Design a protein around this ligand. Structure first.
Ligand code: CA
Ligand code: CA
Ligand code: CA
Ligand code: CA
Lengths: 469, 466, 467, 467
């Protein structure tokens, strides 16, 4: 009975003109409007400017659009496993502007919310603040364009970046269910950027896996109120591409690092755990320590990999791996997820590092002119203000220390690491300098001196304990 | 998993003298009344409370007024609250008004690690410049005034800087919660409970129904459990319904009948109480509008039928309401992101004064009728077409249409059309131009009945909606 | 060694229609009248001019109104300029007011590569909120209003953002210049010529005296030649003296002056507004030695000169010829308002149209009726300094000048420390009036009836008056 | 006649209590109140915080206070030839905060002027904006403290740093002449920071080489108006230490200097830094008349003076004694950096440790080994003036100096236009290099292996030299 916003897929997309700015939902392939992307490929519109968490993958969602070089510029938090995207960045076909994930989500929200700008501690003192990130090459490996700096201001004695609202000509979203007046319901972690994206475009287009009538969706269950949606399309049903089909049915220093990291958890903690050693450590949490895992793409209550029967493209973790959920879990959008993180609602954040400094700076982020992926949610995670523990092997395989006085590699966050756990040692960062807290059963203080690239205090060292099985 | 469930007394025993509280609710809807009663019993004093309003007499935050436990209220609207209004005027309580959209988003920003953000809301008003009376001494004289807000230009337009709100406690009421704190709300009782939920160091949630972890669908959780520290399951009670609305005035009918012709098909509209709301009842033959209510609903309907009355389903004026097919519920941060982002096609409100400049005064007259800005400051300043509906002259013979406002401005350069029982005006180039007239008074007699001059060359006759 | 010397005509010929100018001068003093004359001759139109004032009728900038060569004025003061005020009222001219101290510092900031800076001046006035009428239509209807200034807090108090001023030309006048453009000024005719000289793309100076390079002591140079593009030597002419003041009934005025005179203490540096505050400097008691600051760039200002020591280059803030005393010092207008905005005055005494229990003051303009401008008063009242208002207690007609809240546009918000009248001396304490003294053997009861607000009156003494 | 502020040296200084913030005039030893620093040593005040352009020199001025550990913290632009200073920072007894010279001076003025903050392009994108310069060590050479970041904002599409006003308990100043009022007159380049230092202190103490009576300083010749000065001291006569008594009496760098000499052109105002840029001044051909600027407050700087005209008050930026030419002009350091920051130089020619194809420049820090501070280099590079770098093609270690991206901490970002070496001349175009000229018949493949990057050579000529 109500408003009817339904259109065919070609008709909904036909007025996107050359040069249009798009905001696109999706986290990797989860909630990525591939059907609509396939249709905009068909119409052949050129030099698009696209704001999205990533650029999908080779042959999927936004990834489709690189094939006939339809993309001028991507503004993105991560490139991920997208070879055509990286190749077109490196070969000078595409401008690539990085934005930390949480800032990208809040900027889109802001543009929908009539907020022209807001402050965040994210990216402060990084190259995303100072400018000079390589955004465009020429045709012959030469730097053609560089990122513009961010402005900064102090509040309460801490420094923050000014972020500007993002407003687009079009927004493209995917949802599990929509009604005819454009109310959208999402499923699992495929929600993600689809809420902030739907709010920031002048013309918003939603593909729905299920169209229902007005009044079929409980108003209390609506995730994106129909006011935001202009056009709804019902593509023929298709299987969302699963990047990492992870299911439940060497050099194991990693297990030792994970077993010590496991002693960091306390009962009742909410935790965000990075790919690798941090996640592994969750397997060694003792009985009587109940912690809830958060996934930055919009879950708390994250469980281990699903059993075969539970494998679901809508339920993946930050590394695009298929995931389960536990009793009392809860889904939220990407803006809420980074509000959660930025607002320091995690009790523990556990991350890897390529290099970590005595002052508590750390570098993963990138290596310039080299293997360059993007900030992802790493910059928001570390600037949370919350307890950050780094779990990493003590040295590079060639001997070079990963624990330094100050970072040579570009900084992910400034003065944010509290504790460094390696196979040899546990260091606290106390007043911008290092204190050796623990050493492994029969190493010595003397060898850890030699394996770390800075001095430290060692006036009260204990043996490093490990959690069992 | 987690069990955060707790007695009423234990949940609240840690609240000390001087504590700051952010408290959910819109009027009585979603107001954690039971927790407020407990706070009264424990007898803490010098509370500083942030909330949309302060409940009503005998209900919610209202009950804490009667033994003078409240030092300062930061509020959008006083509402139907006599003890609150009384204590402000007599100097027992300090009152800072915050526009409702700004209050909700400052709480969210508090929860989200965003120390400040810009909004066009309240620019050029007393809420930006300072000089609203926030405290009186005990003989009518001014003790304290509101501090100015900073301003900054973006794209040639001026915005107010709003600061994050963080409280010692936040207090929240939900329809359902599980043991680990996940909340689901019902109807428009959601409102501020989500942003309030996010901004407190210690967050306490009163639930109407407790369920076990895993009874709530993860996709139906409105406040994730990470935000809640303490859940309490009070003795079940009914939410107080302020106005149980169920299915010589002619001046308000004709203005509402002319104002219904402003509705075009497919519009999303926010109506004020009084004349703008009654304009909906004359929505013409083939015009589909969707009504927004600032407390967190699109698809608002007429008053419910007697047996379908529901205390969680109320409009801005605190009346029981229904929902139409395709309705959607959302929290107050989202409500004002919708409004401040220009997602309404029309907002229609009333006035104490409206200028030829486009200025509108409609939120207080100093020392006499002080209600607060409500959502009105947001509604006027978001670039949405604003049509004011009001009787041509006030309850003297003085024109409610003046050259420049003398009462405190709700917003500047914002009214697009003005509709009265005798005339209709448009604001062009910061000045008044007569586009319609009916009841059939000529230009000269209305021209004397208004407080300003005006252009009047393409004047047609004013129609009415049947 | 450079030679920037040119004819008057060739120097000015490059000013195209719509050019923006910054122009030196305070009133007539240091106003480049010979160049302004030339700009009239060549007939350029739609000028945008920044200057302290706009000259006077028939002199300096005022000359340019005769042929409607001015589109927009940005000034602090209209002054004795009837064409100006009139052309504003009847829609020929756009007029934007800027506090004098802000105007000087914005010019310098424009010269100094500072895009913006913060000042307390004008905070909470019409000049920061927007809504001063900058342009009328031809029927006295409002066409344009001033745009708001941004504001930020520092150290718990609010400040206005001011933007740099950079103009197509700057026009300055000096007593002396060499061929490479070093300028030396005389008396208070320096004023805006320094910052004006810094902010122009093409800066032209008229000099009363041209000398060779090496003839000016490098230590006596006021505007370094690097700043000056073109130097002009007009045929010599007498600077217009507005008020040739010399040494040789309603006398409420003299009782107020005599009470205000008791506000002075030994060692004070003081700025006194025109009227009663200046008259009070006549009744300064015997052991009290003060230095008077004149906002156009003088400390050590003395009384009017003798008949044959009159000097057009030495005038006070009200454009009157004046002397200087032993140990006096001249400075330019940026410096002058750095002095003031910096709190270096010990007392500032001002008149009022209206003064509030609040401590607000209104004394600079009344929309559509008095076109004056803020002058230096906004700067004077909003720096750290003690402000005393000397005013008649009531209007002529009997309405109070001491009100609860200002109805006229406020010069400063919460700034007045003491109010002295013929009846009374009120202090402003915690945002309300406390009566401290009353006159004569008048009564608390008559002053209650004469004041537009209530007040505290629990330690009222009798009002003393200097000898 | 007037006020009297004269005091003895001991009494003027005795109420400086421990933990006191001082602002001190002087540039090297020029205009530095040495006698007062001496007396302050006598009194034994502890834990001082000092804002000054430098910290004098061993045994001279602020340097006299490092001997008995009297200084907690220095806020400085340049440490410059001060071994006790550099040593106490390194081992960890003195906290050292670097501030760009122009920013330092304007912050002090701002403190004097009631301007809480202002913006400037100086230091944007450097370690002085981002934080992470070492400001205090411990005993074992680890970082106890880092500088806190500067905040930043866009105006007109360009990023500026926010600078905070400096106000101190005391300001110590030296002047050539003062009266009893406190009106000061400075001499030569000994003015420098003394004007803005004199404005920004609660209590300001001035040592005068010459005391005169009120009325003996022409009011038009006063450089610091007496309002700013609280106490005037007249030490026993003493000679200002000359660091470099350079005088005019009766080969790799010569080639660069002769090419650099061609950059000059008639009418230019030019700032030359120490080394090859100052050398290039010697070879200006023809009737090419330039005017040389010294950042310490001179335009019209000439060669090293003849023996009998050396004067401690007339020094360049490298603290060398200097002559001045016809048309010269002196001004204080706030004005100097307004002149520089406001783009009033046509050419600034500088040295480099590294220059990038980017156009970035590193010339002020090399971590651990040379940590003397930004001086005025950051102000000179970010003011939009045409900047030209003169440098040897390689290090003392044989490494290349034209690199891709600076390894060393940057003085300025995308600032350099032309790079001049003995081997070649590059232009920075579109954010990368482009070789335009070579000399000695060495060719486009000989320089490529000697420069640290590739570059463009689409239209190359050979390098002309001044005779
Ligand atoms: Ca739309
Ligand atoms: Ca909590
Ligand atoms: Ca010029
Ligand atoms: Ca002083």
């Amino acid at each position: 009975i109500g408003l009817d916003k339904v259109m065919s897929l070609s008709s909904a997309v036909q007025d996107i003109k050359n040069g249009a700015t798009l905001a696109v939902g999706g986290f990797g392939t989860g909630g990525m409007p591939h059907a609509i992307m396939q249709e905009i490929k068909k119409m052949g519109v050129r030099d698009l400017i696209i704001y999205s968490d990533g650029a999908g993958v080779d042959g999927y969602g936004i990834g489709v659009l690189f094939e006939n070089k339809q993309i001028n510029k991507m503004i993105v938090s991560y490139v991920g496993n997208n070879k055509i995207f990286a190749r077109q960045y490196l070969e000078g076909d595409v401008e690539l502007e990085f934005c930390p994930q949480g800032s990208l989500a809040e900027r889109m929200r802001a543009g929908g919310a009539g907020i022209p700008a807001f402050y965040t501690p994210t990216a402060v003192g990084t190259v995303l603040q100072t400018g000079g990130q390589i955004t465009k090459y020429d045709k012959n490996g030469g730097v053609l364009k560089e990122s513009t700096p961010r402005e900064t201001r102090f509040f309460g004695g801490r420094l923050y970046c000014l972020e500007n609202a993002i407003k687009t000509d079009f927004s493209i979203v995917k949802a599990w269910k929509g009604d005819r007046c454009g109310n959208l319901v999402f499923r699992g972690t495929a929600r993600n950027f689809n809420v902030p994206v739907g709010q920031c475009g002048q013309t918003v287009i939603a593909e729905v896996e299920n169209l229902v009538e007005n009044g079929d969706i409980d108003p209390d269950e609506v995730h994106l109120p129909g006011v935001y949606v202009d056009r709804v399309v019902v593509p023929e049903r298709y299987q969302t591409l699963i990047e990492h089909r992870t299911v439940t049915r060497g050099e194991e220093v990693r297990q030792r690092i994970a077993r010590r990291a496991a002693l960091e958890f306390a009962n009742g903690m909410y935790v965000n755990l990075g790919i690798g050693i941090p996640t592994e450590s969750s397997n060694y949490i003792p009985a009587g320590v109940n912690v809830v895992l958060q996934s930055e793409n919009g879950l708390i209550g994250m469980g281990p990999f699903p059993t075969e029967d539970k494998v679901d493209a809508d339920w993946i973790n930050a590394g695009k791996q298929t995931i389960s959920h536990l009793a009392g879990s809860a889904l939220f959008d990407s803006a809420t997820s980074f509000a959660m993180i930025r607002g320091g609602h995690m009790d523990l954040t556990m991350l890897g590092a390529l290099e970590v400094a005595a002052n508590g700076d750390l570098a993963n982020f990138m290596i310039p002119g080299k293997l360059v992926k993007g900030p992802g949610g790493a910059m928001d995670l570390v600037s949370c203000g919350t307890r950050v523990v780094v779990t990493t092997t003590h040295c590079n395989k060639n001997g070079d220390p990963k624990i330094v006085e100050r970072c040579r590699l570009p900084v992910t966050g400034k003065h944010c690491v509290c504790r460094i756990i390696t196979e040899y040692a546990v260091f606290d960062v106390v007043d911008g300098r290092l204190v050796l807290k623990e050493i492994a059963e029969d190493t010595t203080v003397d060898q850890v001196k030699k394996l770390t690239g800075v001095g430290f205090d060692a006036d009260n060292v204990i043996t490093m304990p490990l959690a069992p099985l």
